[PDB]
Design a protein around this ligand. Structure first.
Ligand SMILES: [K+]
Ligand SMILES: [K+]
Ligand SMILES: [K+]
Ligand SMILES: [K+]
Ligand SMILES: [K+]
Ligand SMILES: [K+]
Ligand SMILES: [K+]
Ligand SMILES: [K+]
Ligand SMILES: [K+]
Ligand SMILES: [K+]
Ligand SMILES: [Mg+2]
Ligand SMILES: [Mg+2]
Ligand SMILES: [Mg+2]
Ligand SMILES: [Mg+2]
Ligand SMILES: [Mg+2]
Ligand SMILES: [Mg+2]
Ligand SMILES: [Mg+2]
Ligand SMILES: [Mg+2]
Ligand SMILES: [Mg+2]
Ligand SMILES: [Mg+2]
Ligand SMILES: [Mg+2]
Ligand SMILES: [Mg+2]
Ligand SMILES: [Mg+2]
Ligand SMILES: [Mg+2]
Ligand SMILES: [Mg+2]
Ligand SMILES: [Mg+2]
Ligand SMILES: [Mg+2]
Ligand SMILES: [Mg+2]
Ligand SMILES: [Mg+2]
Ligand SMILES: [Mg+2]
Ligand SMILES: [Mg+2]
Ligand SMILES: [Mg+2]
Ligand SMILES: [Zn+2]
Ligand SMILES: [Zn+2]
Lengths: 91, 102, 69, 55, 211
RNA sequence: GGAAGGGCACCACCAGGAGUGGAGCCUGCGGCUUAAUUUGACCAACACGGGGAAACUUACCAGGUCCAGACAUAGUAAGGAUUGACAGACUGAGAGCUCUUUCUUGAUUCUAUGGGUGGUGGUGCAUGGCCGUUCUUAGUUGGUGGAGCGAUUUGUCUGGUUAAUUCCGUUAACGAACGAGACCUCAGCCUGCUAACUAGCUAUGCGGAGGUAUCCCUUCGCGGCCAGCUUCUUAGAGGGACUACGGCCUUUUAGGCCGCGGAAGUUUGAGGCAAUAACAGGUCUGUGAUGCCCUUAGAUGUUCUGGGCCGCACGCGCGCUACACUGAUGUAUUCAACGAGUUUAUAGCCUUGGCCGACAGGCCCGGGUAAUCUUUGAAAUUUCAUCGUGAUGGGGAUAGAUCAUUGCAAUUGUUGGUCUUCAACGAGGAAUUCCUAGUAAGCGCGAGUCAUCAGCUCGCGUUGACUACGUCCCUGCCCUUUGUACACACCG
């Protein structure tokens, strides 16, 4: 799905910084509550990550919960060019 | 340095609510304070009646669901610090405490 | 299902081998001359050209149009 | 679709503006006390919510 | 600033949603239940599970992730809601744990009869007064059927059911459909109340021995 | 079983009440019509799917968009894979949907092959869960013993008794486990306990009015957190009924009838919960519950516009309004309960008070996140007049004109006002429903649906009866005996 580079960078930055991320199943929501990016773009990017196993997805009561994995952490570090010392706040 | 401190207690469990009220009353009495209450408001009975069946077949049977809320009011003639110290006592889950002035 | 009218085809952008190449002219001395206007909009900035339509000039980024007679 | 067309119909009221917070179905929504749950979901989750059957 | 009715209803809805989310997330890790305690400027969530090692993860990574996601989803203030993990005492007396164990055994290819008998024996040896396991669905044939296994005391009518009976229902997504498993465990009177209801049965009369 | 015996039930009858079935209309079903008039269901479908659909809901129909087709491989490609867009045309349409004209963006995509995803798409005769029914009745099953070659049987019974497989007893059975009961909720009594400025009473102080007007009496309004109190209101703990006591009948039993007292003597009344075994009963259209099958880009996905679900020779079900004087209309008069209520933005929900207006409604100050404000909170009914047996001042169907509010949109009238029009209907055939006391019936009120719509459902109170307290005649249910050529079990 077509996503702007700035939106993808923001989503990846937030995911790496927080270690987790939730999203209501609202495709037409203008903006994600925690991220300025549209909810649809956030959901689809997270689905893309889950497809290749960068994240674990859970669904309950019309909500998505995404938890980063080790492979996802490595991919986000390489893609954001962050130093190896910096790690998600969860750890 | 004396004020009418209003304490509002709300819970779904009558036993826990009454026990907390008694503990607060005894704590206030032990300090030689003036205690008015507890005043028990009429019980709030949230009622929902929904059809048992998940479809439209069979005899129309209904489930009466009730959620009871019990509220208590306690008035103390003492200072903010002493009422705060009294309310610092342990409170069991399911009981909501609110402390205000007038 | 049955269809009456012919199937519609979604728009596909026409391929221009070098659209940027025709936006500049280079002289022998090395001076560069631009054959198309530049959008005055600050957001577009310098280097953003406007189409030379047969009745107006159109900017592809901000959509600004200037009609000339 | 086009932004001005896709999902452009107002949804400020009516059954289409509300859905069950548990299953997302738009039918038989219990709006009393702000539950916002369809009747089936509410009957399933009443014990957890705190609704007891006395009569 | 909402009314008491809406406040209490929202508390119940939050409890139900958290229960469902925790069940979905910790299905395999084992999830006996959850308890929510509210204190001034602090809320505690206790996850009762049979395998707290998996729930916590390595160095509490999983539990920290769960706390962060719960806070973000439920608008909780930073450093105001915190999660604990707790062992379940006498896991055999919890239907949810036994139902999950039976689900695991059935998904592992174990025979339904053997699995149900093992669960029944474990429940009985764990001190349960009585217990019952029902497995419904397409078993051995395209025609659905029900298998009932029962041993010990059991009550089904009246108020004492709500406290002396602990029951759970679960679904197993097998290759050819869905198998519904129901576990029903009858507790025993406990004067302390830790392992059973702190109330005797209505029709139980005890006469003290004369001097 | 159109076989016998015993017992039981207003989803049976008897004795009766209200009725329904007849009229108008509301609403659901079939049929018909239609582009569609989406569809499930036929005691146990038919105001049911909480299903009162203008848009959405929506699943149907006529059209237009979009991908919200992850991931892997291959192709193309920075000499640009691909996105967006001004103006004109096109289009129902400020959908670049598409074409003309050519600008912008940059590997996020496009193309092909696999694999996914979504689907109120089929299958409830593949399923889970849930619910309904068998079935509101009292029924159901082990262990060890006894009998039989065995299927099976006794326990679980001749009799008495009970609402009860409830008990007393008899006994090849003894001990047990479910169901019943116990249980829990509401209501009924407490001048006894605890506590109430978010509930009241009493007396006092002051003030208004009336009466002899000072003092005295009647009735109102306001203050006393140092006036007192908890009868009235609220809500916690407890008490209270156990047939306790008296007379008869009954096996010296279990128990039954009557009776004083008592708030209560039908299990005090009404509910919740509710066994074994089953139905190819309903639900895939509650579910990110689910197998398989279908479709998956010109889509059965999603969204936008419009229409339809409401269409009217006809038949049926649940209901609302009536046929009138035990009444209609117009005054005066005054007694409830269960409940529900806000994002404060100028303001969103319940709305008090003031002003404007005939009404419908509008404007302005404000109260209430609530025993604090709406709530000082109904009708039937009571009382006095008009009407006078006339389809009449009964009845309010149909229809015209016109004015307001909700909504983006009111036409196929959304709903609500004013005037005007004034249909059948004069008590309803065969048939047929519910009901035994604060019950039937009448009367209204709150909530669910809800931007606006209740003739529906779930509850509430107000006035308040007739008849019976018995039976198995009809319709069925439980047990026993008995016959069977039935076991898909007499719809055999
Ligand atoms: K009639
Ligand atoms: K019905
Ligand atoms: K089923
Ligand atoms: K035996
Ligand atoms: K299916
Ligand atoms: K639903
Ligand atoms: K009979
Ligand atoms: K019987
Ligand atoms: K014969
Ligand atoms: K026979
Ligand atoms: Mg029992
Ligand atoms: Mg019972
Ligand atoms: Mg009769
Ligand atoms: Mg009729
Ligand atoms: Mg039709
Ligand atoms: Mg029946
Ligand atoms: Mg309507
Ligand atoms: Mg539409
Ligand atoms: Mg529609
Ligand atoms: Mg669809
Ligand atoms: Mg079926
Ligand atoms: Mg034997
Ligand atoms: Mg037998
Ligand atoms: Mg009193
Ligand atoms: Mg069937
Ligand atoms: Mg319809
Ligand atoms: Mg009905
Ligand atoms: Mg009154
Ligand atoms: Mg007339
Ligand atoms: Mg009239
Ligand atoms: Mg009948
Ligand atoms: Mg309805
Ligand atoms: Zn520009
Ligand atoms: Zn739901």
């Amino acid at each position: 799905m077509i996503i702007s580079e700035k939106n993808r960078r923001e989503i990846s930055k937030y995911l790496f910084q927080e270690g987790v991320c939730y999203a209501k199943k609202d495709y037409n929501l203008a903006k994600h509550p925690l991220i300025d990016v549209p909810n649809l773009q956030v959901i689809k990017l997270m689905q893309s990550f889950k497809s290749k196993e960068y994240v674990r997805e859970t669904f309950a009561w019309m909500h998505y919960y995404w938890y980063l994995t080790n492979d996802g952490i490595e991919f986000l570090r390489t893609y954001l060019n962050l130093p190896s010392e910096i790690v998600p706040a969860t750890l | 340095q004396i004020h009418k401190i209003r304490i509002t207690l709300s819970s779904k469990n009558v036993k826990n609510l009454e026990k907390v009220c008694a503990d607060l009353v005894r704590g206030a009495k032990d300090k030689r304070l003036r205690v008015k209450g507890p005043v028990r408001m009429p019980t709030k009975v949230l009622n929902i009646t929904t059809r048992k069946s998940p479809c439209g077949e069979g005899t129309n049977t209904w489930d009466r669901f009730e959620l009871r809320v019990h509220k208590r009011v306690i008035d103390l003639f003492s200072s903010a610090d002493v009422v705060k110290q009294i309310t610092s006592i342990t409170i069991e889950p399911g009981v909501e405490v609110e402390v205000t002035i007038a | 299902k049955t269809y009456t009218k012919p199937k519609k085809i979604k728009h596909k952008k026409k391929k221009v081998k070098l659209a940027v190449l025709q936006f500049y002219k280079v002289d022998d001395s090395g001076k560069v001359q631009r054959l198309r206007k530049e959008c005055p909009n600050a957001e577009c900035g310098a280097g953003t050209f406007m189409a030379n339509h047969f009745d107006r000039h159109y900017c592809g980024k901000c959509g600004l149009t200037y009609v000339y007679q | 679709g086009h932004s001005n067309i896709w999902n452009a119909h107002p949804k400020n009221y009516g059954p289409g503006s509300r859905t069950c917070r548990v299953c997302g179905n738009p039918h038989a929504i219990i709006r009393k006390y702000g539950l916002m749950c369809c009747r089936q979901c509410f009957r399933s989750n009443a014990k957890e919510i705190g609704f007891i059957k006395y009569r | 600033q909402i009314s008491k009715k809406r406040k209490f209803v929202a508390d119940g809805v939050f409890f139900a949603e958290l229960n469902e989310v925790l069940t979905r997330e910790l299905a395999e890790d084992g999830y006996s239940g959850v308890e929510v305690r509210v204190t001034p400027v602090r809320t505690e969530i206790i996850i009762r599970a049979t395998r707290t090692q998996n729930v916590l993860g390595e160095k509490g990574r999983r539990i920290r992730e769960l706390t962060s996601v719960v806070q973000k989803r439920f608008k909780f203030k930073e450093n105001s809601v915190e999660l604990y993990a707790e062992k379940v005492n006498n896991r055999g007396l919890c239907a949810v744990a036994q139902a999950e164990s039976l689900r695991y055994k059935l998904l592992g290819g174990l025979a339904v009869r053997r699995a149900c008998y093992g669960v029944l024996r474990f429940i009985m040896e764990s001190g349960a007064k009585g217990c019952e396991v029902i497995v419904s669905g397409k078993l051995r044939a395209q025609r659905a059927k029900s298998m009932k296994f029962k041993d010990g005391y059991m009550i089904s009518s009246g108020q004492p059911v709500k406290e002396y009976i602990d029951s759970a229902v679960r679904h197993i997504l097998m290759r050819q459909g869905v198998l519904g498993i129901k576990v029903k465990i009858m507790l025993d009177w406990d004067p302390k109340g830790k392992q059973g209801p702190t109330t005797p049965l209505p029709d139980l009369v005890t006469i003290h021995s004369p001097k």
